[model samples]
Target: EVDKRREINNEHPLLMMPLYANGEEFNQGKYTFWGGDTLTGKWENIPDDLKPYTVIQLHPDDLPKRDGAARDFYEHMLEEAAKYVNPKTGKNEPIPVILTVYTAGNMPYYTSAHWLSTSWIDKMYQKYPNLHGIFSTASYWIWANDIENKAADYLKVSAKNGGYFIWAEQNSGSAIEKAFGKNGKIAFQKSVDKYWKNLIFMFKNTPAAEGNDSTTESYMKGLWLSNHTYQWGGLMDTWKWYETGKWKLFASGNIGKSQGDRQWLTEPESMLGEEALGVYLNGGVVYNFEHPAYTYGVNNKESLLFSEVIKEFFRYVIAHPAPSKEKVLEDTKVFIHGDYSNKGNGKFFVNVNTDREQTPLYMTGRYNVIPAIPGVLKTDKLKESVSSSRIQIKEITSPEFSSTQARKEYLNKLYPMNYEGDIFAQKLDNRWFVYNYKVNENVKQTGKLKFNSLEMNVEFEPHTYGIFERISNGLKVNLNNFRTNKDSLWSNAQDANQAKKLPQLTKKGAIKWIEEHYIKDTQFGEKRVTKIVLRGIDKLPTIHSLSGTNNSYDQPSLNFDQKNHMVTITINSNGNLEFELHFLEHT
Candidate 1:
């Protein structure tokens, strides 16, 4: 029957709870034994049967002794607890217990202390697999150090040795007393009321315990209870009275009721006596109750409202355990205004609005569905539906208009330079598309190049021009000259002799000269000229040279006609190898 009981009782797994003991003296400023006994007293009266669930908390101050006396005492206590067995099943399962070591307030001291070092703890756990957990009030473990690093070290020694949990309630006593009041008492019950709500707020709003599993969450919950308490000062009289009432409130199980009522309580006139003191000590009053004895009172009604807001916040989180992860992966479209002739699979189209000087647009799309079966058409073909939702399309286009005109108007008011309208332009299909003021030189000479796809009789100005070319082979050179060979008279001569001779020629003489010298056509087929060298003597008349010699000596000059195209490229003299031209025309 005992063996059968053990087999059927598998659902009720062992529950291990850790209680902070030795630190209670300094923590509470007073200590009480379980059944009102001293050393080897009521603490020993804890039923032998229920002893498996209890673990001793070693005080932070006691653990640091150099005599090694505390270590011997701790080991003897654990060995004694191991003798217990379950009476219901008669199974000789040893009671697993945890021994806690405290780190006063410093984390480095706690981690390095020889009495409870991690290495020593691991050794003890290896010798005793049933040891349940380690308890500590080292706040640095939770708040200062990285959570993951501390947790990893904790799991290696505790969980790996058949110990599946850790109790971290060591600091709760001091934390609660500081937060609420001193001497296990609370001067203002109303302040205690606000703190309770704030505690709930912290847990619900902040990530409770960060872990891949819920073990950390459960352990943290237990830790909260061990550290929770109320202490005294400010507004109310006598810290002793406050501590007595607070402990009684817990002893009577009225904590939950008090918290709820205080949340709704009004401020009393007497509560306002230490208004500044209250704020300084308790971080300010959150709520108050006006008793009939006083006329005015300071209240923390706003804090109570905030507390309710926090409550609702946590309720929302609890209702929705997991956050939403849905996201939109794709949502964009491209539509053509007219003509489906250019529309088909693997085809690209450009949308241009020449009427309003709109930018050139490019759109690409693919059709995923086709009708008919391979080359065979059936009259009663199955109507197939294709989801266009999954179809992917992309477009690269320009902004609808340019800000140049507005900017020019703004600049014109502030400066002396006349605002020449902007040469708004974009490149598409190896050509430049431009929009500019009608009077602007680049726009005036746009020529008869398919503006609006309509042929219009338009005359372009000679000097004002724009060129469009496919820049397939990278950089192209453009040269500018005043006149072509047919119109040499318009060309400026570099020296006085050439200028004199050119002006003296008659029309008939010019014709003869052209025929004799410059009229021949030469085909220099596709020769690659990578570099160009310009050589010329300086034509400036030096004072010294002019005084001694003739300044009318012949200087070489090249002539070109104005009717035909000529190129004159300006080179940078700063040795940067850079060049520029005023304009280039594509005829």
Candidate 2:
């Protein structure tokens, strides 16, 4: 039962020391695991930037045989470490060690009966003051699912004994920044956003964040960065990576099997560009844990996109830095779950749009005296016919769904059903994290949802649901002022000519054509003679063409001018009314 070969000396040198030795930060890089040789004498050889803290693997599976020797080695190293002085403090600071432990029921250590427990911290780690953190490596969902119901227990012990408890594969911003750096990061972001909320809900509502099976200060207090990744958990992992422990510091990349490095697929280059922005934004680390041969393999287009989003997270952080620690969890009770950083600036909101007709979604907490975060205050609410007109809306709370059948079906598409059917709302950052459990494409509808004082009018696309941020001004200008003038200028041959040129017309062409044709006449088709007027234009609307970029478009067109408040829209009625018009900022 004792595997003596996997002792302290046998483990690899792993753990990213702080990038700046003068600071108290933890950064990831070439600093590998700390072996016995490095521990014995190689102290001065290490660079200042790479010397803050080293990691040692605490083989939980073989504690019976390896425990005594591990302590002896650490004690010797601790005695020798006080000889050298730390440049930042001038004191002989003993090199800090973050012990890496395996989650119970994970790999070699497969049972709860074994000593992979947090009590191990009380026995071994508490003896040494410098044994600083605990790194739990497991398949992603171990936290959300709470294997053996020990996740909170682990967090409690880590917080009480070790300063940090870094969970494996739990950084949304990094994966968000990673995928956001790539093309489908939106899908990835949306996915992790929901996943992040689920983690929060457990900590906030349940005993997961509690101490002694009752209640305690938020476990998130001690939570730190995670060993993040590009393709976090794959098909085999069943999207389990989405819901895991929410930490203060998250490492994004891959495993030897991952820092923030990668190994599995073709990574997007300069992708870490966005990832780095988020890391610094949150005051956190970055590294590319991939195969050396496949080091620079990258996607350029995604790399370019990463640049745009990198600044975005930076802007988000600048605009909304972490608030006072007291104000951090103040409004968290409004949320079901998710990570809320720095007075909850780094947060997300998710709730279902149960309103059939358009209505405002209001959260009943603090008033809106605070300036809202820009662009981030938007919702996934769809404007198409299916979301707006057809379906009925209703409210369903946690542990409740329409039927077990619908719940099971919904979980099939987005599985790991532990929290899948939860019809609850979570408020984080500045938005609402809404969980929608729509079993079929047609039956789901959107409308009004009131959570506390915050009321929001929401609508959503089919199949996809979650996350809503209320826009400050969304007054819908009446469609009554529209002028349906018919044009008599068209000949039989004119229709064919229009069709031929339609392929080449961009949004620029449509705007130009609308200006020329609005005053003119069209003979027959009601679709051909459409003129839309914006009557309640209180403020100058921010036109899409304001940038002067000639973006292309096909078929159904809608063009507007702030000067005259006149617009033109042509839609082939054979299809559903599929157009989105937003009179944002207009009174």
Candidate 3:
């Protein structure tokens, strides 16, 4: 009888039975994000360790109707949340109350029939270590039935109408299931609900004078789902929604590109370069939008592109953060033309000159090649690049230049994602990880791979759009592009044009490779870092920056910057090193 009031199958844990029960919002669980998180009273005001967030909004709608009083009100709020208590600690433990549902991400699908159909939620999240994390909407922004079949239509409709699967989620008759039983699932859940039903809030919240503690600007908010977008604007091509949500950091149907769904709203705002520099290029947590119905009291000087500079890009992204993938460290040589990694503080690329008129010296300020290991990386990519607001992706769509002080200086250099950071060794690590660029589309194909070493040219031009970094080398080699000792530019110059873009750091006069990376006593040794100075040069390439370039901050070693240049160091002998006291900005 309509699966005997549901809740019968899979014993229960089935993604927390929606606040299911306990009383006055009961000891509840599973369900939040209709109004993307944040509250003052009631439902115990949410937040029992997020990461277990949940949301699955999608439209063109239909499917959410497994029938009869929605299968007896979800088998009576999931028979009182099957007792519950997976993460309380101090006392008892019942576990498995998990609801981290989210894949391709509805389950990171490596397709074992998409994990014998979602009942696997990715091998039960690699066999539950407390499955706590996931929830998504626009699941990779609608990937062929979103990240491939919404968790196999919620576990193949609990195996074709058996039990434990009763989703209705208000918009009824179909909110999600994407496809099954009738295809037009309530007209694809009301087609993107009129561009995300006015979105009400979560325009990246925070600021009614920063109230809601909702994880105090949680980086990319765990699956409380992404911003509820709408058309009357342009964010559609946010660098193709950050290259399909950054391949969900690799794994699960890894979709590296393809994602510009509807970036309209009358475009312009100088088309963000690196898509406004990928909201501070990864290490995560950077979503913006103050959509108080397009901002408290409308006054679009001519455009409101999400309240112009979103609180100065939220204090230039909480003054550039990033450092936690357990202090991160990747890029050991893996840039088949464009895609740099590595982190403790720096190194982040996106380059994509996919090539047009060709631009040689292609790439390789060396890698494999992951040799440098002192206070980690420093610099070489010849630093000095933030390309003065040359945000590309233009074909001139009217508004060539309409005054209002040129629309507030193109909304003060709109959609900016140029590139600028410094850590010239022994001193700064100002921290600003981002390298998103996409000028006329792919140039120089991506510095050709080799991972084992030796091949430093890097010109990279043609259709233009490059984001080079430097800061990788144990010590010595005027570091150039995996970090910037002598190769950096893009504050505008149509993204690149110094003979298409040259960053070969050196080979003949010196600084080709002197890498080092030893640790102990205090740990944390080189993953990447390089930087060398003294312009109008006679090139000594890098004798460890001319033997520590001439040596105390307190007990320090040579460091002058601010154009007086000269910065050199070599801590290792258990000088034991330490950092994180930045006043920030060395320009």
Candidate 4:
């Protein structure tokens, strides 16, 4: 019965190619004739030698008339195909096949409802690893729903997993008529050209890049011709022109009955046959075209155009395979600016550090990294750490200053001196200090250094006289020859407003001051000792002002004087800060 349905003329080009079974049609008859048979009787008759290359087109309508029959058939076919082997060759000759399902029909409700049952398709993929193929007769109406909602998942499961292609039909005659009214063939041709171009763009831009090549270049040709020429109610007269070289006039008045005379639509000249065959014979999949004739025509022409095209296209594709990999790595250079203290300033070179160890590293391209203000140092002075070889830095600025006085004056305006005080001892030998200053508002470094440190010199003041009274453990003495420098005291009191000057100290002095005053005196007791604490003095908060030019592009200048532990931040404007502090130690 299958052979009878596939009767072929000796001269037909399709006879030279392999024949594909409509899995759905065979399964449908199997159930009807053999009493709910899962495999059609044709399975037994399929030639053992040809089984390896034979593809089956399974439709959902054939399986157990249940909800997930489509998915079940997909799994069953893969399992059965795995069982077959070539006895003569003693080799695993599993069928390399495709499974196509249908969803559209004339019944509006049934057609729409059938699509809602895509769970079967999803389940098929979950159960069967080898199921591969396309969906047939996918109209925009259906795709608007399916592709829009499920394109990403489908691309991964179907396109990436060997199934690729969509079977679509272009009803040129009716389409042209609708777009341009009466005589719109020329305009329609242009529109079609633009439409295909856009389709090509969509194919290229989509994530399924390789899949696009398979569907657009190979499968598309076969599907289009099949629906336009061989389907039952196809444009039989119009399509016959390719072979007969005689164009037939379409019926003028009656749209419904014009092409309704023929029982089966007649095949046109196999102009696109070679292209279609090449796609499949070269590893491309099939996309069977469903045309108007299949639904409306009394008879449908079962031409082997799809098979023919597949064979030809596959031959070429197999000879020329696509490129193996397609991702490229790019190089980028970045320059990061330093903060007001000028910490980060220099050229930064970063390699493409991928987590994949085996991938080769390449940095042939030039990239830019914008720098932020205080400005990065020179790149040449940068060096990578011994521990981590990935990073390197170069410093361009020098560090130097004249005197503590000069430094204090410079920094006083830049960074507001909020407080100044002397360390004092409490009754319990605890030390305390104070700051009597506060800023009116939060200050931002508008491309300016808004703060600085200070160092101050100090001298002790004495009273008139003193006398020893008692001694402890017989270790004391009594004495009275004590005189005070009243005149000097008067002079010192007169010169109280005069700025005091102190000799600059080395890093050793700063360390000594911190240890004696902060660590031992202020923090140390019988238990733990704290190293650092801020004692408020005359709290003097700063009022920061924003200058329009403060945001200029030039790098802000900075000066730090180690002599007095004072730092001056200078902006483009004359803005600055001066500061000073005194360190004391008692034993």
Candidate 5:
């Protein structure tokens, strides 16, 4: 307010930022398949700050082909880029360009078209040097519906570009971040790409980090917060990116398609200001967002609001301290997925002070912890929501829903209106990837997922981590001799995992799966975990934790096939409560 908006305050801390608009194609209607359809709307009055940049937001269907929207988009973009002439050279210099491609959910994407491919990365189609980053609205897209591998194929092709970005169009959270930051490499080549990105979404209200070298750097090229849960001011949703450098974040202006009877329709002019303002504050490129091919563009309130906000946001970014040297560490630590709805989300890092002697001991804090990275198959999960929740009003200081009819109407206004993709994903291959989706308006919810009371699972992967709410069954495993053995895949319990296929989840299937992968097979030391579930023989294995006034279950079936396994196991019981096994610190 103070800095950019003289009317608000004399010296506003984060008040009154200036916002600028980026250049883009003409709007003919809400559905212009070609860029040349009409050239005078948002781009008509280019601001000096943005004169040097040109952003092209096109349709996904246009990518599968080269003739219409795709071609005209590049053409107009080239025309605008030619405007920034170098004074010394007396010739037009290529300026920066942010490219965004929208989708028709699962329908138009697979309808088949030429998306950014190796050829585009090769710069054959780019035709200029001012390439900021190539973005895919399909970022939130779920591969479960992409049965034809259309998403992956598009991604694989787009990865040819060093600046190419692809993120979950819907699943927006730190867990998804783990999926991309960690699992992407484990699953998709684009994570490391060998050939591409991260899209950050809002917590709950939707789907939406960092780490791993090839991991973090890849997405840093350009981050996606597009179509994320942005309402009112974007202050809260944006600051995290600034402090974390979470993915070279980009704030974009996106509008809704007024056609096809879309539920996500926001006038182009309405969303422009927020999008442009968001990008500026986050220290990244700006876009008109998803202004359709035709609708006169974002010329309304959005455009004006952003025009003022960007100045402050950009100034703040430029005013920040300079960078220092970097240190890189390769760690085998798999973070436990925590509750994003928590006060600090996953910020409070726990001190692992407990020694390995008591092995696999657990602790309590903000959220439950899981030590290992549970793997998944691309072919499985995604079609449904495996998680359920029970809200506990730990502290409801404020009320959310008001009595205003408009507010009431807005609540049921059909959001998450598009293809709401997976909240959690199971890795399929170095190539294949799959996700779990919410089939309704309700943003449903995974880790080998340790959700509070919400029992969840990624398809290919079942809900091993669950809270029954009644007589819950869990194992106090020492799979230790009450022992140590490995290398050969032996009695290792629970065979729920398979390298490629959806593991043969027979009784032994899950247990053995755990042994070969997650547990510590001390004999051969063949386990794929931390100190082998932290047991090492000393591995520290624990639980999501369980406690009740009087909870009881049949004693564990201490059977080991005489081979030493399945010790103290409680079979199925009540579903009323789930007690995640926990190894206490003092135990």
Candidate 6:
């Protein structure tokens, strides 16, 4: 019997019934969950081309009230999606589904049995590539159930069918509250390291998948699905620090409602820091929201929009193209953790040791250093000191942060990742890519670069992130005059007249002599100012200088730095130039 009006299911309002000419039926199409349209619409309406992009999210909260309702609902959706042929792959591939399952503790009615009673999930996943695996609110389940064991159970099913289990550890939750309440913010700070234990367990204990090594395969991953914009403040640890690159280091999940619904005013630096950290570290960001919420100006007088923040992130991404996954995986140990692969070539040294002052090194060779402040030093395990004969001294590269007025400003906003504006350099193929996200201060990093046999002074400049490159070898040097003809220079000294003529070229405190003759080729486009350091000198020499036979404009300029006892010369021009250095203190 039909009344004047029909009553919708309170539990499943998204499941609607429409009256037709022949019969009445429920709309078996798109639905809403957590106030947003599931990326998947009606299975029939989904185009073959767009099937790859669609992800149907089935929530336990919205399952119909009936026996085996969950199992039936999931199977039907999977079966229907498999009917369409994916034009891209030329196969009948179903749109993937991320099932939101619950433990008995959270919702007894919709436990694992309710969701996976029949072999449909396992069988359907194998047949159609449908199940993209389980999604869980990690913090909630951590307190409600035996999370480690439950994770293993979910993983066993997901791994068997080529899927991944995603855990969203929202920094604010019952788990956080139960452990520590009013000081949950402090817990938030320790949250990343805290969850790392669970991740390590999952990494070590999960059963090996087919055609994959258990130790090397990264099937399990996690995300920072914070409830607020400020919750992303806790991304301090780099994924490589764990000796595995499985975790998405700076993943930013959906913020509460829209990014700006909360009436609380926030600080710009806080927002800028977190946004920068997420993009710079992870190479991208994840935002899942119903409304774009361009404006973050609620009760706050200051007006910063979500659009501007994302634009800044996009701008950075555009400026710095991501390195290939193969290279990153291969060089994972080379940079941040330990150079276990023996691929890293250089070391960055700070004069005074501050535990927080580890520098990142990038260069033309296979040696690349991943950026991590307060990270393990590359020289820590590899104790072999590079020969002092190959060391060069030069200036390189150019270069911060806050919380706010309690909740009104700083605390409510995201904090910038430390070393946020630091420079990152890489050499792929023939060219070296240098990038700097910092706009304020200049960052000067001094280091030794291995250029084939001869080590040279390499300086990374503020402008050089935008520097020029050449297909030719870095710098050409001809030591034939000094090496082969030392007898000729001595012969000139034997003749009294020749020695008198060369007196002006030599100084009273002179101890050593050498001539560097090289043709500065036209293709050498780098801003390389060569500096020859006279190692043991303590004071300035009265007449130490460079006297060139060819006084051409192309000759590099020379400056005797008395303090360091090194001659600084500009190598911008092309031609042959003879460079001689004398250290009075050396003798």
Stretches > 4 Å off in candidate 5: 1-69, 72-76, 79-90, 101-106, 109-126, 138-162, 166-168, 172-302, 321-587
Q: Give the TM-score of candidate 6.
A: 0.33
Return the number of clashes found in candidate 2: 68
For model 6, residues 206-307, the per-residue Cα lDDT tens digits are: 111111111011111111111111111111111111122111112222122121111111111112323233223322222221111112111111112222
lDDT ranking of the models? 6, 2, 5, 1, 4, 3
Worst 10 residues of 2 by lDDT: 230-239
The sequence of per-residue lDDT tens digits that candidate 2 reaches over residues 1-587 is 11111111101112222110100111232212211123323344343433432333233222223234333333444444434465658887565654544443344334222334567655545666666555454333332223323434444455455244444432222211122123222432333332321121111111111111101011222121110111111001101111122111122221211101111111222222322221222222222122211111111111111222222222333333323222322322121112222112222211111221111121211211111111221222311213223212212232322344442343234322211122323344444433222321223334444333333433332222223333444222111001122222222214333422323333233223333442222111122121223343444433221110012122435555566553444323211111234554333
**Cα lDDT, model 6, residue 357:** 16
TM-score leaderboard ranking: 5, 6, 2, 4, 3, 1
lDDT of 3: 0.22
lDDT of each: 0.25, 0.27, 0.22, 0.24, 0.26, 0.28
Candidate 2, RMSD to the unseen true structure: 21.3
Q: What's each prediction's clash count?
A: 26, 68, 80, 54, 86, 12
TM per candidate: 0.25, 0.30, 0.26, 0.29, 0.34, 0.33
Rate residue 552 of model 1 by lDDT: 13
Candidate 3: tens digits of C-alpha lDDT, residues 52-102: 221111111111222232223222322323333334454332132223233
Model 1 Cα lDDT, one tens digit per residue, 228-287: 211111111111112122211112221121221121121211112211111111111111
Expressed as tens digits, the lDDT of each residue in 391-455 for candidate 4 is 21211132211332432343333334232332111010111111101111111211110112212
Task: Pick the winner on lDDT between candidates 2 and 4.
Answer: 2
Instruction: State the TM-score for model 5.
Output: 0.34
Prediction 4 TM-score vs. true: 0.29
As a whole number from 0 to 100, the lDDT of residue 61 in candidate 1 is 38
